[PDB]
RNA sequence: CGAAGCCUUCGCG
RNA sequence: CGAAGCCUUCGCG
RNA sequence: CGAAGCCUUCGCG
RNA sequence: CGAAGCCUUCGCG
């Protein structure tokens, strides 16, 4: 797992986390924790969840980048574990 | 653990998480993920972390209530574990 | 006795 | 052959 | 929201 | 920021 997981951090973190989620029979989730700010400069706060494990919450400027950074944080956490 | 952990959900989640963290030799952290909103109506976003495990991020109106809500979520998860 | 944590109140900014 | 996901681009509200 | 291109991965062969 | 009060937990006697 670790090998491909490292690869996914640079190119496409969301894809790597979904891959991890499939290969362990788990459904991945990206929770929109919070939305704030004016419409032209909003701030989104996202959190990745896999099965029963929750990951670092992140601030981002767009929903896409919210998911990307949430995935990225989850991936770094999982790589750290071993 | 589960017995006392249930009790702390009503009275003081922050204390219960501190008990859990001590009794498994873990350092607890309450991360201020985000602050937003106007000065008289701020919104804070907190996340509890115990050792290497991160917990649901929560919204609250004050820092203390932020920590308490994060702790409460972590406790509900840990009771869920068994 | 020695600590730690929470909540509450009061004053100040 | 059948899915899914990123990258970029274009158009619509 | 509607598409195209390109990449990666999954699944059945 | 400076105090006060409560409750809870832990160790010791």
Swiss-Prot record, chains A, B:
Catalyzes the hydrolytic deamination of adenosine to inosine in double-stranded RNA (dsRNA) referred to as A-to-I RNA editing. Residues 2-11 are annotated as: N-terminal extension of DRBM 3 and constituent of a bi-partite nuclear localization signal. Homodimer. Homodimerization is essential for its catalytic activity. Isoform 5 can form heterodimers with ADARB1/ADAR2. Isoform 1 interacts with ILF2/NF45 and ILF3/NF90. Binding to ILF3/NF90 up-regulates ILF3-mediated gene expression. Isoform 1 and isoform 5 (via DRBM 3 domain) interact with TNPO1. Isoform 5 (via DRBM domains) interacts with XPO5. Isoform 1 and isoform 5 can interact with EIF2AK2/PKR and UPF1. It is linked to Dyschromatosis symmetrica hereditaria: An autosomal dominant pigmentary genodermatosis characterized by a mixture of hyperpigmented and hypopigmented macules distributed on the face and the dorsal parts of the hands and feet, that appear in infancy or early childhood. Aicardi-Goutieres syndrome 6: A form of Aicardi-Goutieres syndrome, a genetically heterogeneous disease characterized by cerebral atrophy, leukoencephalopathy, intracranial calcifications, chronic cerebrospinal fluid (CSF) lymphocytosis, increased CSF alpha-interferon, and negative serologic investigations for common prenatal infection. Clinical features as thrombocytopenia, hepatosplenomegaly and elevated hepatic transaminases along with intermittent fever may erroneously suggest an infective process. Residues 12-80 form the DRBM domain. It comes from Homo sapiens (Human). The chain holds residues 716 to 796 of 1226 of the full protein. Ubiquitously expressed, highest levels were found in brain and lung. Isoform 5 is expressed at higher levels in astrocytomas as compared to normal brain tissue and expression increases strikingly with the severity of the tumor, being higher in the most aggressive tumors. It comes from the Eukaryota. The gene is ADAR. Induction: Isoform 1 is induced by interferon alpha. Isoform 5 is constitutively expressed. Sumoylation reduces RNA-editing activity. The third dsRNA-binding domain (DRBM 3) contains an additional N-terminal alpha-helix that is part of a bi-partite nuclear localization signal, together with the sequence immediately C-terminal to DRBM 3. The presence of DRBM 3 is important to bring together the N-terminal and the C-terminal part of the bi-partite nuclear localization signal for import mediated by TNPO1. RNA binding interferes with nuclear import. The first Z-binding domain binds Z-DNA. This is Double-stranded RNA-specific adenosine deaminase. Disulfide bonds: none annotated. Changing residue 4 to A: No effect on nuclear location.
């Amino acid at each position: 797992a670790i090998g491909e997981l490292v690869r996914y951090l640079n190119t496409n973190p969301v894809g790597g986390l979904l891959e991890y989620a499939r290969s362990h029979g788990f459904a991945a989730e990206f929770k929109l924790v919070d939305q704030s700010g004016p419409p032209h400069e909003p701030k989104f706060v996202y959190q990745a969840k896999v099965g029963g494990r929750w990951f670092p919450a992140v601030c981002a400027h767009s929903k896409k980048q919210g998911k990307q950074e949430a995935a990225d944080a989850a991936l770094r956490v999982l790589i750290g574990e071993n």
